């Protein structure tokens, strides 16, 4: 699957016709510091079946902005150009997979 991106091609990511997980986290995010481990198993666990495309927050002002995107640590789900679902804070993978079953099922 896809990985780690930067501003100019978030956009190339989340147009694709697929189940598009924009990891937002940031360079500082306590909770985002642990939550970040725990999308490594996240991506481990269905690798394949979705993109997952983590960045540092702060380095792609381009539609963070437009989704409130300050409460990292962050996960959008898009395809098309749309976000299907966005999750906020630390929510463990039993939350998580289960909230995003509705692209994992």
């Known amino acids: 699957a896809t ?3 930067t501003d100019a091609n978030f956009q190339q990511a989340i147009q694709g016709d697929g189940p598009v997980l924009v990891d937002f986290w ?4 306590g909770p985002c510091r642990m939550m970040a481990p725990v999308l490594e198993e996240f991506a481990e666990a269905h690798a ?3 993109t ?8 792609n002002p381009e ?5 409130g995107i300050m409460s990292i ?10 976000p299907v679902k966005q999750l906020i804070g630390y929510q463990p993978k039993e939350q998580l997979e289960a909230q995003l079953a509705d692209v994992l099922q």
Do not use: R
């Open 63 to 67: 539609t963070t902005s437009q989704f």
């Open 52 to 59: 997952v495309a983590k960045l540092n927050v702060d380095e």
């Open 26 to 29: 940031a360079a500082w995010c």
């Open 3 to 5: 990985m780690t991106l």
């Open 48 to 50: 394949d079946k979705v």
């Open 73 to 82: 640590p962050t996960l959008i789900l898009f395809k098309g150009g749309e």
